[PDB]
């Protein structure tokens with residue numbers, strides 16, 4: 001059926017026309033997605049350890065906490081180094097790709113030791129700053145070896161963007177989520193293809209204006225395309241959106257999905273958390289429905305959720321206003 005069109009890498013194109021508070025603009029993006037699910041219990045678990053202990057470091061007060069945490073990551077690293085990631089199952093253990101994979105953890109352990117030295121000395125601040133640089137390695141290596149890669153570069157084609165890039169992330173292809181083999185009957189998104197689906201949202205920015213978006217996601221030839229119109233009203237000119245007070249980063253979220261039998265579709269809600277420069281957080285409340293375009297039948301799911309992670313970055317050679325996006329996403333909430 002429609003999931004078959006996602007079994008390999010798929011080229012993507014994104015076009016957005018926006019008007020916020022009268023500020024018109026256009027964003028155009030291209031890239032690819034890779035929705036196939038493959039998983040390793042061992043890596044999953046090593047990666048959980050790594051992930052949790054980084055957060056412990058970020059919030060820690062004293063060196064004792066940071067040392068303890070860094071030591072635990074180091075074990076996970078060396079253990080993760082012996083695994084075979086799902087993306088490289090078919091590769092020889094001594095292949096160039098598997099060597100690079102292992103080399104990724106040689107860098108990572110190197111960086112951890114750097115952070116250990118600073119921690120042992122009592123330099124908690126400096127250690128936390130050295131712990132941050134691990135993220136760069138994670139991002140580089142996730143982009144080569146982690147499953148479900150969605151990758152896209154977006155350019156503001158009308159010049160300077162009058163809203164922060166982070167606020168447009170959600171709007172700018174949930175058909176590229178990884179549904180685990182047992183949850184494949186709950187994947188509305190892929191099921192609707194190639195005729196595709198209409199995706200509508202209202203996004204309420206706490207104590208500021210709202211965005212209201214309408215989009216068509218469908219295959220145009222071999223490309224999965226996402227085309228959106230977006231109106232923003234009621235934004236405050238010294239607010240976080242129009243005042244450009246949002247940090248250039250993105251958090252991880254749960255996206256809650258349920259069937260909407262009335263509309264042969266799905267209703268969807270979540271709350272995006274946008275970090276602000278001063279240290280505060282600004283909530284973006286998402287209300288969403290999806291409706292098929294075609295008359296063909298479509299999988300209506302049970303309650304479940306998508307778990308998301310995103311890295312935002314820049315192309316050092318790009319002079320236009322832009323955003324590079326790396327994103328991994330997995331359906332969850334239903335066992336065997």
Ligand code: HEM
Nearest residue numbers: 039040043044047050051085101104105138141145146147
């Ligand atoms: C501090 C650094 C890192 C963190 C915080 C981190 C975190 C994570 C997280 C949270 C996941 C998702 C696990 C899940 O889906 O349950 C993951 C997956 C993965 N990571 Fe990392 N990671 C880091 C570094 C690396 C490095 C250096 C590599 C490669 C050398 C790597 C390779 C992978 C792979 C292949 C997956 C997919 C696991 C699977 O699907 O079985 N990671 N990581």
